[PDB]
Scaffold this active site. Structure first.
Site, PDB file in Angstrom:
ATOM      1  N   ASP A   1     -10.266  -4.263  -4.744  1.00  0.00           N
ATOM      2  CA  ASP A   1      -9.536  -3.575  -3.670  1.00  0.00           C
ATOM      3  C   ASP A   1     -10.205  -2.226  -3.476  1.00  0.00           C
ATOM      4  O   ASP A   1     -10.288  -1.446  -4.432  1.00  0.00           O
ATOM      5  CB  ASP A   1      -8.066  -3.396  -4.072  1.00  0.00           C
ATOM      6  CG  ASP A   1      -7.181  -2.725  -3.034  1.00  0.00           C
ATOM      7  OD1 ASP A   1      -7.650  -1.751  -2.386  1.00  0.00           O
ATOM      8  OD2 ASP A   1      -6.000  -3.121  -2.916  1.00  0.00           O
TER       9      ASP A   1
ATOM     10  N   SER B   1       0.828  -1.195   0.000  1.00  0.00           N
ATOM     11  CA  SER B   1       0.000   0.000   0.000  1.00  0.00           C
ATOM     12  C   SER B   1       0.880   1.269   0.000  1.00  0.00           C
ATOM     13  O   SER B   1       1.718   1.379  -0.898  1.00  0.00           O
ATOM     14  CB  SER B   1      -0.998  -0.063   1.157  1.00  0.00           C
ATOM     15  OG  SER B   1      -2.050   0.884   1.055  1.00  0.00           O
TER      16      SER B   1
ATOM     17  N   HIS C   1      -7.611  -5.178   0.463  1.00  0.00           N
ATOM     18  CA  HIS C   1      -6.462  -4.284   0.373  1.00  0.00           C
ATOM     19  C   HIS C   1      -5.192  -4.860   1.057  1.00  0.00           C
ATOM     20  O   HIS C   1      -4.084  -4.396   0.776  1.00  0.00           O
ATOM     21  CB  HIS C   1      -6.843  -2.947   0.983  1.00  0.00           C
ATOM     22  CG  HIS C   1      -5.834  -1.872   0.720  1.00  0.00           C
ATOM     23  ND1 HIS C   1      -5.787  -1.223  -0.491  1.00  0.00           N
ATOM     24  CD2 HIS C   1      -4.868  -1.372   1.525  1.00  0.00           C
ATOM     25  CE1 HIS C   1      -4.801  -0.343  -0.402  1.00  0.00           C
ATOM     26  NE2 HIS C   1      -4.223  -0.393   0.800  1.00  0.00           N
TER      27      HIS C   1
END
Ligand SMILES: [Cl-]
Ligand code: NA
Length: 268
Positions: free
Chosen positions: A216, A94, A245
């Site tokens: 996601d 991320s 995610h």
């Protein structure tokens, strides 16, 4: 050592090469729990927590240093230099994917490759750009954090994790999200959600592997193609048939083999 203590740095495994694992917002190094066992026999592995994670001291959260993602990139470089790591394979989850990219612009010599998981250079939609969020969406998210941080965590964690709302992963992420000091979560959430790394992607010189769940909450699939098309380095994309995610935590059976293939093999 100050650096190792501040970021809860853990060094494990053995091997010729070194893998450094960087986590995303709301979690910590425990996000790598299902990946680490598959790495330790073959590589040295470095785990660390981003400043501002719930496991770090809120008194060391420097608002000026972390007002841009480059502050986190400088911490990552400080960790590598502290351990005398001259080269690593960096796996960034991320926000850590963009932190890794920025660190590779400052120090390309330190990275042989970047494996991105759930990466995005920009979350806000722009003229010819689908990021997944309109500014109004983020404004409601920040108001929810100001209004009631505890309720926001409980409602957000299942949506961010995906899958069954009562899974162990949902419980784990709800807990790490709520371990963040509420004002830091708001500050950091705003810095990330408002970032724009698009302009620098053509200057990247380290090979990138772009991995994401097909579903996601914060990363539309088109972002993986945008990264592949604009990164100035050699890159490859692998969209995984998963939901979430943090897919390395929530669907390890299907996700871990994909991550391992991109760590173990290089772009031809
Ligand atoms: Cl390099
Ligand atoms: Na590319």
């Amino acid at each position: 050592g100050v650096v190792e203590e501040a970021h809860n740095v853990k060094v494990i495994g053995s091997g010729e090469a070194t893998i450094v694992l960087g986590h995303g917002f709301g979690t910590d190094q425990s996000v790598w729990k299902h990946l680490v066992p598959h790495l330790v026999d073959d590589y040295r592995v470095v785990l660390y927590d981003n400043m501002g994670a719930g496991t770090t001291n809120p008194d060391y959260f420097d608002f000026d240093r972390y007002s841009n993602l480059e502050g986190y990139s400088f911490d990552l470089i400080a960790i590598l230099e502290d351990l005398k790591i001259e080269s690593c394979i960096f796996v960034g989850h991320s926000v850590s994917a963009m932190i890794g990219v920025l660190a590779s612009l400052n120090r390309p010599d330190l990275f042989s490759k970047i494996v991105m998981i759930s990466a995005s250079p920009r979350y806000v939609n722009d003229v010819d750009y689908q990021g997944g969020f309109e500014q109004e969406d983020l404004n409601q998210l920040f108001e929810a954090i100001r209004s009631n941080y505890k309720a926001w965590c409980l409602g957000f964690a299942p949506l961010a994790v995906g899958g069954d709302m009562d899974s162990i992963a949902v419980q784990e992420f709800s807990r790490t999200l709520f371990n963040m000091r509420p004002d830091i979560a708001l500050s950091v959430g705003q810095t990330i959600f408002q970032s724009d790394m698009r302009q620098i992607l053509p200057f990247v010189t380290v090979p990138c592997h772009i991995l994401q769940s097909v579903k996601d909450l914060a990363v539309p699939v088109v972002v993986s193609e945008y990264l592949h098309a604009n990164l100035g380095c050699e890159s490859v994309v692998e969209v995984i048939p998963s939901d979430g995610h943090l897919p390395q935590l929530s669907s390890p059976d299907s996700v871990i083999p994909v991550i391992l293939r991109h760590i173990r093999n290089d772009i031809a």
